[PDB]
Design a protein around this ligand. Structure first.
Ligand code: HEM
Ligand SMILES: *[C@@H]1O[C@H](CO)[C@@H](O)[C@H](O)[C@H]1NC(C)=O
Ligand SMILES: *[C@@H]1O[C@H](CO)[C@@H](O)[C@H](O)[C@H]1NC(C)=O
Ligand SMILES: [Mg+2]
Length: 227
């Protein structure tokens, strides 16, 4: 009860959380036909994301629909390279090597190695993201990161801390984040509980600023801080 894997006619995204929400049925389980009201209600119901943040993210998602000025998207629209989907993902390979939508064990093993305690803090999250950016630049001859992609990358690391964990301490249990990525299921049994306070655009911006502030390069090696 409450969760079912995708089947052969269902579509999924490069987003661990939207995939999780579709697997649970907060979003349509086939991944298709997601509108702004469905996004607001699903992310509100599951996670207590604010309507305004849900609407902002919906607006970006709709730009990935190949139909112009669309009022919906399908989860696989989000996989289109270099719209929202970007290189140096934490758990997906770069498009150049292989499909950038599905979980990739080799890539996630790299990320996990920078989560060095039982509790992930901002420093660990920033560290992991950094190593992915530099690794992709040095191994992918087609590596790119647009301004929007950089903003998305920073906000994805802010999101797993603040939405799955405690936005005020800016920490999250490592096991919870691992579980989300590796199962695309919410880690209720490990202790996750939907927060009582809504998660807002300003919350995401505050954690994104914290991520950037935890980066200590002597000199920035490419696009590491663009919002
Ligand atoms: C309508 C809402 C959302 C949209 C449109 C969206 C879109 C995306 C997209 C396109 C990616 C792939 C970027 C890439 O790594 O190449 C992504 C990754 C991600 N999203 Fe979402 N997302 C949404 C909501 C959420 C929420 C609520 C969370 C909360 C935990 C979340 C957490 C993440 C994380 C952690 C990644 C990085 C995955 C990896 O780097 O391997 N997203 N999202
Ligand atoms: C990821 O790490 C696991 C856990 O040690 C290991 O069994 C697996 O072979 C690794 N995968 C890659 C592709 O390195
Ligand atoms: C990749 O690294 C080079 C330094 O070799 C830098 O000039 C470039 O901006 C980096 N690319 C991105 C997209 O960050
Ligand atoms: Mg990617």
């Amino acid at each position: 009860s409450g969760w079912q894997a995708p089947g052969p006619n269902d579509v999924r995204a490069p987003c661990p959380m939207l995939n999780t929400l579709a697997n649970h049925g907060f979003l349509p389980h086939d991944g298709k036909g997601i509108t702004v009201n469905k996004t607001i209600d699903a992310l509100g119901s599951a996670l207590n994301i604010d309507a305004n943040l849900s609407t902002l993210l919906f607006g970006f998602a709709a730009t990935t629909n190949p139909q112009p000025n669309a009022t919906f998207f399908d989860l696989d629209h989000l996989s289109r390279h270099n719209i929202l989907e970007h290189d140096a993902s934490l758990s997906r390979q770069d498009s150049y090597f292989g499909p950038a939508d599905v979980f990739n064990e080799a890539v996630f093993n790299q990320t996990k190695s920078f989560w060095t305690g039982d509790i992930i803090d901002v420093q660990m999250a920033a560290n992991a993201r950094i190593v992915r950016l530099l690794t992709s630049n040095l191994t992918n001859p087609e590596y790119s990161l647009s301004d929007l992609g950089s903003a998305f990358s920073i906000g994805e690391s802010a999101a797993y801390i603040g939405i799955l964990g405690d936005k005020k301490s800016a920490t999250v249990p490592k096991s919870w984040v691992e579980y989300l990525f590796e199962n695309e299921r919410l880690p209720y049994e490990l202790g996750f509980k939907r927060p009582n306070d809504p998660f807002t655009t300003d919350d995401l911006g505050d954690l994104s600023t914290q991520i950037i502030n935890a980066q200590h390069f002597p000199q920035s090696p490419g696009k590491v801080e663009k919002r």
